[PDB]
Amino acid sequence: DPAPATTFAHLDATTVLSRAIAELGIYPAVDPLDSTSRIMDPNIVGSEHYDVARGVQKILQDYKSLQDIIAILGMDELSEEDKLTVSRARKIQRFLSQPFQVAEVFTGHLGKLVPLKETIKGFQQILAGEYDHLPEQAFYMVGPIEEAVAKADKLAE
Amino acid sequence: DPAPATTFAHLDATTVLSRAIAELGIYPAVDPLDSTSRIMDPNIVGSEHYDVARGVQKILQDYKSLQDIIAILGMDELSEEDKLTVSRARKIQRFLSQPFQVAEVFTGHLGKLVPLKETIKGFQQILAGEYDHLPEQAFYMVGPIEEAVAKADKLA
Amino acid sequence: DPAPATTFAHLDATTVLSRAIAELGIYPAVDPLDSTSRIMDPNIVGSEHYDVARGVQKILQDYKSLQDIIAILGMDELSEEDKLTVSRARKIQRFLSQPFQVAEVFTGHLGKLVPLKETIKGFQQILAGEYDHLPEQAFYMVGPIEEAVAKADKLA
Amino acid sequence: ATLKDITRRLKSIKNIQKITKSMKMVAAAKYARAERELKPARVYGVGLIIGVSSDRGLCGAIHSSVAKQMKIIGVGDKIRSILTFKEVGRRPPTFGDASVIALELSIIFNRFRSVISYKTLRNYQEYSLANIIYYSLKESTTSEQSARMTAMDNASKNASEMIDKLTLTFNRTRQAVITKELIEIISGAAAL
Amino acid sequence: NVISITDGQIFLETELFYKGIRPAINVGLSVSRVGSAAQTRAMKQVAGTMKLELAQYREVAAFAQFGSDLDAATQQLLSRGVRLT
Questions:
Q1: Which residues have C-beta within 8 Å of that of residue C83, sequence separation ≥ 6?
Q2: Which of C102, D69, D171, D183 has a Cα at 20 to 30 A from D92?
Q3: How does the record describe the protein's post-translational processing (chain E)?
Q4: Inside any domain, residue D192
């Protein structure tokens, strides 16, 4: 749309929200593959923040590009590494969600604020395979990565 | 289109005919899922008529949602429960076709008029699984369910 | 699109230059199945011109069918009928190439301008099998069929 | 009915078409080796429920066709899950595989007609038992890899037709968006 | 307009960008009509081989995550291809 399209060039950082994402219960409904920042540079945020950020986006793009194919040919036709990034990407999609203090009337969850180092570490860890044994849902709608381990135990029964 | 879209609000019943359905030889080419009636209410038509109608529409909608997979992969990749709704749905579709007196030149069949009770019974029986053994084509271009059964026996 | 659609109403032929063909080294890189003519009609050109062209087409189309059965079973599991059409088709593909006079500088080969009756004759005979004893690369970058003989001797 | 949609649908189906075509040919090569290997295994074959299928799906009604004639050993991953050995169908069945199966101990399997068709002392007994396990097994992958080749042929052709039809829809929508957008501009300009 | 006016185009894509192909150049679509005439002999040499090997890669690139029993010749195309990429 001319209006939003013309606004992009006036910005240093953009957060793009998506109805397709909100529809899933992923809130905040941010598109991880359409939000950008002028300071997303290894010389500014450091190579560790940057390499994790880029790794998260890669695994989501790869999943995005698999979605529709396996939705027809089945999950079984995937190699044991193609389906590894499927499980991991789905955890990461869930770990990007987060209950907002200001959204308690909607989530029924207490709001969480997550420090940068913990955000980075959390995603670093899922990317590295550290939680392949936890279930997808444990990553849905929590703050720090410890809350997802907590949640996994709570789910066990 | 503005013309038809504006007309919908003026009607108590709408019969929406579909080219897609026509081209499959279903006549009359009524879209079972796009045609509605303000008196389709259990307090007006009674609960048996209402329930059979809603059951037909459910199976047809269920079938419609399976049709993406059918188009690419075909019947073989379906579960046994889904193969059943497909085969009942396809029977229902054909049972909704009907020879019209006015269209005898085009069908090559004599025209039929079906009493409402025989209409309810026929579809009620198909839904209940009473004719899973009969082939699809037996339900095409008949009046009452009895004709599709006779037609089934004739197909030897 | 209106622009191409309006243009096509005026076209009597298409010449389709193809990158696939170019990378296979066939000059000129004309797609022999994709290019068409409106006057490719026995009532307009020869009844002999028409059947040679139709025969060339069918064999080139038939060669394409067999190309899946080659990278699977190898070019030996084919029947004697099917081996024959591969050998003839490939000689036809190469026989459709031509050294141009206008490209004497860049290449080095001498330019050829083939008369219509000689073009018709050449292809009619590769189809007949009057050159099955000759090697495949005898037909490449020559003019008339008389240079396919001269080039097959110079390779002995 | 959005240019946005159509483009996504088109992207997936072009790749499905490419996959199913490669899978078609993988199976075509496997059916090739399996039909030739079937010769010294059919005449060789002339001299509790056992269900013979495999691990891999996408071969139409191979796995469900024996599972129906089933209703107790299930050779093939797919037979245990729809109703006991893993890692079959993938690599051609050796007489050694047939012995690994019989060591752990009516036979139901798919018998190869064509690429398109298929239908569902105490030292001597052990060799004749393994002679049946092997026979059913060799017959089975011929029938599976034929079927998968065929089914993957069909899916590829079905995807290809859907691609054609969606491209047409794409261009019709594409042209109408241009025209509608222009008519809006004109009507506004004219009304002044 | 600007596509027909120019001698060639470098096409960038979002999807290449997030897959890690940065710079995000669609090498199958991008074109320079000047081409070789604007390359030194040394580049011309290796670039010519790269082009061909990448084209042949593109033909096969969807058998990547769906390829167990591909012939060794095409595992070679896949491998040379991901590496050149």
A1: C75
A2: D69
A3: Acetylated on lysine residues. BLOC1S1 is required for acetylation.
A4: no
